Design a protein around this ligand. Structure first.
Ligand SMILES: [Mg+2]
Lengths: 189, 142, 190, 190, 188, 190, 190, 182
């Protein structure tokens, strides 16, 4: 990762390329969502809200998904802060990645012309005594209820249509994602 | 100490004058603290205790933003007002707010356009042709 | 982990994002609670008390749990210092995570609208002779007694109810946590 | 990685070789295209678009291949930014590597006199139930069709010719890559 | 590990160096040779920096090497400053030993820290004579530990012998009654 | 890696030994050639060609060889840039190492008095169906043809003699390397 | 390893704890003596000798032993330099640790009140042909002869007693180390 | 360890023209040593250079790269065996400038024929064996030149592992004198 140095009257700022992008209120989500990544993303969102409470923030997405809990942390932070968050799918938005893609500000959700998005029901696992299998299954089902409900509220699609379509792995082009309501338009060059 | 301030003495001997402070960002930031009283009240006290009145002067402060400096201010991402706004915001990070608040107007000079360069060449050539013409050297440039 | 540059009258300084949040008295608990994490959190709390003894401190919790000992280290530091510690759950508060969530100052414990909290009895283990297994079991039981007692004192829920409800893994929504008294109110978006 | 101290005016700064080359708008792709490589390349492209919107960019390619998704992220960023990107194949471009070589601006795609390029259908895999293998096969086939469509547009070869040519590994010399239409000329030395 | 800025200097520190500026030494990990070496170097530096202000040793460790524990102990005994010890979470094995090693009246535990004491662990392998030698050495190490604890709690050496036979977990109140700590420090 | 300090009219600069060598346009190729090493070497050559287009560049070679593709990337970069590249074998130049030793400018190729150089046909591999093994074998054979061709052009030895003499491993002393035409003179010590 | 702020007449310098102790001329030997540790100790000794030829040096020993060759390197350097080297056993000096402890300047060798020192014959190994085993055994035996001789010449203890007391792992308290002549006196606390 | 005047210890020693060879002579080590020797030649063409040797062995190639650099540069390279010189370690000790090769009083040196290996077809084993023999020829010849010992005596003494004390190394002519303390 190369370093950018900006020379000023006061001194020298050295940025990694992601820190240089953050200067312009760009946040990069470019890896699997785990707790470390989500904590970084949340702290960046809060910082950008502080730095200026009224300018848009751009969240670039290129993630294979990840932990649902960490993606809800990012979602709730995006929903809390005053600035609108623009979400741009750079290359892939899979699982929670596509959930966060749909979480952008209304009218400010984008995909590049042939970046792909994918939606599926959440993965999980259990190993158990029968009561603990039951508990884990009920928790995972409630998590799917949450995700389906939020997607229905943000795509406008019916909750039955999402329950059906997310059953197996479902791949969508940028145009299919647009007519599915996950994104608002395709970024023409 | 038995010599005055150079600025104070020059202004005292020529109270109707234009004062140019040139490349202000290169100076130490605290040297400008002297001008605070000059711009609010037009009075600078010489170390002898002599008040020199600036009330009839014009005070101009030029500042440079290099090519790299103003390239670094551009937004990186997908997709003159933004230039002025960012340049002024960056100026506010270099000077005290109580200093800029004294200033009557902060003006941004735009990067010269191509036809402006053509007019500049026209004007410089016109001046040269006049100076040579009084030497009876008639000259024209296509 | 990206770097922030902030320009100030006094000059210009670089911060990692977590140190920039720490300047605003925000502490991030983002990881499994182990000895070195809790030691770091204790040191941050102590420094924030030294810097100003009356401004609140905000503890941001996104942890799967961890060592009960380190959790009590953080709890006892939160209780000893004079500032109120606000606790905000971001993603998940589980095990000692939700314990430290309930440890926040009364009226200043929050969760985001669809955070989740989970409570259960502590995990452990014992190996060796019968007397060693007895000793380890007695210690784990007394640790559960401490946890139940503290939670019943801070939720106001009866100690028998917390003993019953922590028997298996118990996942709670933000509203369920508020009605259970683990949090004071759910944060509302603005 | 050797550090360069060369700097103007002050002369005080120092850069690793790659950041110094990034100052000259040189972007260097010498590895397999994974997600974080591509994300770095994309951020560098956006930075270079900000730094100057009309000076060309030079993209030196030597990737053995990589993730198709990451290659399309780079391809779409190259297509979106305003500068022309010159693509220069140095040793081998293969798989998505040669796709990114084709992605360069029309008339500014180059290879050195004895670089290789290779083109082939994308690799993949599937496991599990019949339904899931069907779904993965359909996805991989549609991805192949997308790649062959883009290659047919940028090369100007027919889609059926690329379909036949990409079935096995197809190593091409620089001259054969120019004849095919992946590159525009071979950079004969001075 | 976060970076701290303190305005009056406008100087940058990392959180442990900031604590060390206030003469706070943190022992947050298993005691090994390089950890104890670092703790010794910190104690010597703090003694040189000012010979009369107290030093604070905060303890949250599961134990470790007995030899490194005696290195720390003997350093705490050599220097003139009083070394305060505060058990933050767990003080087990040499951790509770170093907890007891603090200056009398300046040993504290948080209200529900837990401290644990036991006979040391070791191991012996090879010929009968080498096993005998290792057993004798471990027994003399236990004798040293028992003696020091008897001299620093006031508890009889036979009571320490009895109570350390198995693992023994003490709450902070029980640890005060045992005399390992002088009081359980109280919140505002 | 030790640090050098050096005083200069503008001020005082600290360097690591490879960056101090790079200040004098000395490139060190002291490791197995792979895509990351080729990436580094090409980046340095491009930087040096931008820094000054006329002064010689010195490539010190001490490598057991490596990937053929990365070696050709270095070779083609050396031929494409305008500055002359001197090559000095410091101890061993095997496989692509000796090839890159032959790549230096005419008259500016050297070896230390008892360094060794080794030449042999490239290693490769083939797996899968008969058709894929056929395609791999054809590719490796054309790579051998290409290497032999370049070596014959640059040493003046016949293509048949190189084809025979590279069949097995072939160890040459510096004097034998000069006789073969790989280097132009041995560095006489003084 | 923590950072230390020092020279509080100015408060400018931040030191790292071992560099601060080296400013005192305190060399720390806190790990198994391998080779790079010994090299670092030798370099520190030679620096302290060049920095001032007359002031004593202090070597702090806390080590379980190590490579015998490296210990002899430290020994020979300590003998070569002009300053007296004081040796202080902080926690343990075993094998080559206790050797270097005895190697200090006579009258300036100390142990902490309940530090422990241990002496034993050198460990080694031999594998292969009978003649190679013979050669290795002879070399190891002559190394033991060296260690025995130097120990006798620096403790004053008879060589046949050292030859007998090093037969097995011999653990000595600080008092017994003083009576064995290894240390000169036990450091008494204030 | 940071030395303040600030420097890492080896760079401070390098500013005194001390070079440290305290590890396995693999390849990156030798490359770093060659680069240090070249920098010291450029720093001053005539002051001595001091090479401190403590290496258990290494690659023969890297050893010859160091040797040829020591022979090429203008300064005299002093060598001191600080603890052990073995395989190419002792070869480079012998390679010092005559009259400036030293050992500490109870450092040890070891000399032996080079190790290697071969695998596969008979012809490839033959080729590798011939190469290894020619390399032993080179090492023997250079040792006979720089010690003055007869090449057959070296051929016999290096057949097995041959440990030598500092005194024995002086009598063998691997070193010129043992450093007496002061
Ligand atoms: Mg006013």
């Amino acid at each position: 990762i190369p370093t950018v140095i900006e020379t000023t009257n006061r001194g020298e700022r050295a940025y990694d390329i992601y820190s240089r992008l953050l200067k312009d209120r760009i946040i990069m989500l470019g890896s699997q969502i785990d707790d470390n990544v989500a904590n970084s993303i949340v702290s960046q969102l809060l910082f950008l809200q502080a730095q200026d409470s009224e300018k848009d923030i751009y969240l670039y997405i290129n993630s294979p998904g990840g932990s649902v809990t960490a993606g809800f942390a990012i979602y709730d932070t995006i929903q809390h802060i005053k600035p609108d968050v623009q979400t741009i799918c750079i290359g892939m938005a899979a699982s929670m990645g596509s959930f966060l893609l749909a979480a952008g500000a209304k009218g400010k959700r984008f995909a590049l012309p042939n970046a792909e998005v994918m939606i599926h029901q959440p993965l999980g696992g259990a190993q158990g005594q029968a009561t603990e299998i039951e508990i884990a299954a009920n928790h995972i089902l409630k998590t799917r209820e949450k995700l389906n409900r939020i997607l229905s509220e943000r795509t406008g699609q019916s909750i039955e249509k999402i329950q059906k379509d997310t059953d197996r792995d479902n791949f969508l082009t940028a145009e299919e994602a647009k007519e599915y309501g996950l994104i608002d338009e395709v970024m023409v060059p | 100490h038995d010599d005055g301030g150079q600025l104070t003495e020059k202004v005292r001997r020529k109270p109707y004058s234009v004062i140019l402070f040139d490349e202000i960002e290169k100076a130490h930031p605290d040297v400008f603290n002297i001008l605070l009283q000059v711009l609010d009240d037009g009075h600078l006290t010489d170390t002898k205790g002599r008040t020199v009145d600036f009330r009839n002067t014009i005070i101009i402060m030029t500042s440079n933003v290099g090519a790299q400096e103003l390239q670094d201010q551009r937004f990186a991402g997908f997709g003159y007002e933004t230039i002025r706004k960012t340049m002024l915001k960056e100026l506010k990070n270099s000077f005290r707010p109580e200093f800029l608040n004294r200033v009557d107007d902060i003006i941004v000079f735009h990067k010269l356009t191509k036809e402006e360069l053509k007019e500049i060449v026209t004007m410089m050539v016109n001046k040269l042709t006049n100076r040579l013409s009084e030497q009876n050297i008639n000259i024209i440039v296509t």
